[PDB]
C-alpha cells in the first residue's frame, strides 16, 4: 500500500517528474518571501487578524498566503483562473472564438495563449487596483515609511505584479509538461496545504494550555478523514447502463454514468467566482456600502457560505452534466447496431439517458455541497477555526489529489 507507491515511484522516469514538480513549488514558495517594494507586511498581517479584515480570508487562502505578505505573486495563480473563466464564457457567447475553440490542436492552444495574455494583463489591473484603492489608500495605511501614494508606487507595484504573475504562470505550465498532473491546479493546492502542518502543530500546543480538549480535536481529524473517504467513495461510484450489440461483433457492454465527472475544475471555478465580489468591494475600507457587499460573500458567515454552497452545486452539476452526452450517444449506437436492452432505439434512448444522467448528476452535486457546508458547522461547534479546512479548502485539496493520481495511471498505462 505504502510501497505500492514506492516501487511505482522508484522508476526514475516519474521520480524525475516528482522532483521537478516539487522543485517548481519550491521556487514558488521561495517567491512568497519576495515582498512588494512599498508594503508594510506587519500592518497587513495585523489587519488580516482583526475582525474588519476577516473577509480577506479566502483571498489570502487562494493567494497561498501571498496576500498576507504581498509577494511578487500577491494573489498567486488566481488572476489566471479569472482569465480562464472570462475567456471560457467568451468561447460560448462570442461565436468567432467558438470557431477557434473547436479548431483542433493549435486552435485549442491559441485560446490558451489569449488566456495566458488575458491573465498577465489581469495581474497588472489587480496589482494597480490594490495599490491604488487599498495599499496606499488612507494615509498610505499599509505603506512603509518613506513610501507615498504617488504614481511611483503605483507603477512599481504594477511591475512587481506583472513580473510575479509572468514568472509564476510560466512556472505553472512547466508542472503540466515536465511534471506531475496540472500546474495551476497544483499551485492552488500548494497554497492551501502549506498552512496545514503548522496549524495542526499549533492546535495541539494549545490543547495543553487547556484552551482545547482532545475530544473535539479527535472529532475534527476524524471528520476530515471521513470527508476524504466519502468523496473517494463517490468518485469510485458509477451507474452502469447496459448496452448490447447486433450480429460478427455482437456482445454486451456498459456505458458508465459517474456521479461527478472529474470535478476538479468547477470547484476552483466556483471559488474564484465567489472571490470576485469580495475582491472588488472589500479593498475600499471607508465605504460602508461596499463593505456590506464584501461581507455578504464572506464564506465564514452563513450568508456567504450559502452563496458559496449554491455555487459549488451549480458549477459541479453543469460540469458533470454537460459532457456532450445523450443525443450523440443515441446516434452513435447506430455505428454497429447498439441498443440499451428493453428501451427503444432513438428518441426514447435520448430521454432515457437524459433522465438517468439528470437524476444522477444531481446527487453528485448535492453531496459536494454537504462537503462545502458541513466543515463550518463542525468548525463552529469545535473551537478549531481556519479557512484552510473550510470545505472549499478540502474540496480543492481532495480534488487536485485525485486529478493528479488519475493522470499518473492514464500515462502509467501508456508507460
Amino acid at each position: 500500500m505504502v510501497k505500492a507507491f514506492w516501487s511505482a515511484l522508484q522508476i526514475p522516469e516519474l521520480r524525475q517528474r516528482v522532483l521537478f514538480t516539487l522543485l517548481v513549488l519550491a521556487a514558488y514558495r521561495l517567491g512568497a518571501f519576495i515582498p512588494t517594494p512599498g508594503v508594510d507586511l506587519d500592518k497587513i498581517q495585523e489587519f488580516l487578524r482583526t475582525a474588519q479584515g476577516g473577509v480577506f480570508g479566502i483571498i489570502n487562502l487562494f493567494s497561498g498566503g501571498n496576500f498576507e505578505r504581498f509577494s511578487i505573486f500577491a494573489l498567486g495563480i488566481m488572476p489566471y483562473i479569472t482569465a480562464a473563466i472570462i475567456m471560457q464564457i467568451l468561447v460560448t457567447v462570442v461565436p468567432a472564438l467558438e470557431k477557434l475553440s473547436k479548431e483542433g490542436e493549435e486552435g485549442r492552444r491559441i485560446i490558451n495563449q489569449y488566456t495566458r495574455i488575458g491573465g498577465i494583463a489581469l495581474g497588472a489591473f489587480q496589482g494597480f487596483f490594490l495599490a491604488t484603492a487599498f495599499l496606499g489608500a488612507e494615509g498610505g495605511r499599509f505603506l512603509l515609511p518613506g513610501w507615498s501614494p504617488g504614481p511611483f508606487f503605483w507603477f512599481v507595484v504594477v511591475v512587481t505584479q506583472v513580473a510575479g504573475i509572468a514568472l509564476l504562470l510560466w512556472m505553472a505550465e512547466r508542472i503540466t509538461e515536465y511534471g506531475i498532473g496540472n500546474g495551476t491546479s497544483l499551485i492552488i493546492f500548494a497554497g492551501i496545504v502549506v498552512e496545514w502542518l503548522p496549524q495542526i502543530l499549533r492546535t495541539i500546543g494549545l490543547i495543553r494550555t487547556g484552551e482545547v480538549n482532545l475530544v473535539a480535536f479527535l472529532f475534527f481529524l476524524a471528520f476530515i478523514v471521513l470527508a476524504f473517504a466519502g468523496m473517494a467513495a463517490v468518485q469510485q461510484a458509477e451507474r452502469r447502463i447496459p448496452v448490447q450489440y447486433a450480429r460478427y461483433g455482437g456482445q454486451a457492454t456498459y456505458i458508465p454514468i459517474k456521479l461527478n465527472a472529474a470535478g476538479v475544475i468547477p470547484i476552483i471555478f466556483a471559488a474564484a467566482i465567489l472571490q470576485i465580489p469580495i475582491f472588488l468591494a472589500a479593498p475600499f475600507q471607508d465605504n460602508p456600502v461596499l463593505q456590506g457587499i464584501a461581507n455578504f460573500f464572506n464564506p465564514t458567515r452563513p450568508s456567504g457560505l450559502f452563496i458559496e454552497v449554491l455555487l459549488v452545486i451549480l458549477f459541479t452539476y453543469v460540469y458533470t452534466a454537460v459532457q456532450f452526452d445523450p443525443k450523440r450517444i443515441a446516434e452513435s449506437l447506430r455505428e454497429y447496431g447498439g441498443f440499451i436492452p428493453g428501451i427503444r432505439p432513438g428518441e426514447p434512448t435520448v430521454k432515457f439517458l437524459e433522465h438517468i444522467v439528470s437524476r444522477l448528476t444531481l446527487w453528485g452535486a448535492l453531496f459536494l455541497g454537504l462537503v462545502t457546508l458541513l466543515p463550518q458547522i463542525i468548525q463552529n461547534l469545535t473551537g478549531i477555526h481556519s479557512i484552510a479546512f473550510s470545505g472549499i479548502g478540502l474540496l480543492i485539496v481532495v480534488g487536485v489529489a485525485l486529478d493528479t493520481l488519475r493522470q499518473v495511471e492514464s500515462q502509467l498505462m501508456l508507460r
Partner: protein, 46 residues
C-alpha cells in the same frame, strides 16, 4: 426532480478504504514536504 436511483454500482464497496488511504498519503506527503520548506528557508535567513 427528487426521486432516488439508489440501485447504482459502487464498484468499490470497501476499496473506498484504499482510495482514502491513497488520498491521505498524497496530502500528508506534500504536507510534510511543504511544511519543512518553511524551516529550510528559516536556516537560510541567517
Amino acid at each position: 426532480a427528487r426521486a432516488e436511483l439508489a440501485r447504482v454500482t459502487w464498484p468499490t464497496r470497501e476499496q473506498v478504504v484504499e482510495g482514502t488511504q491513497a488520498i491521505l498519503l498524497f496530502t500528508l506527503a506534500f504536507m510534510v514536504i511543504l511544511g519543512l520548506y518553511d524551516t529550510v528557508f528559516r536556516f537560510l535567513i541567517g
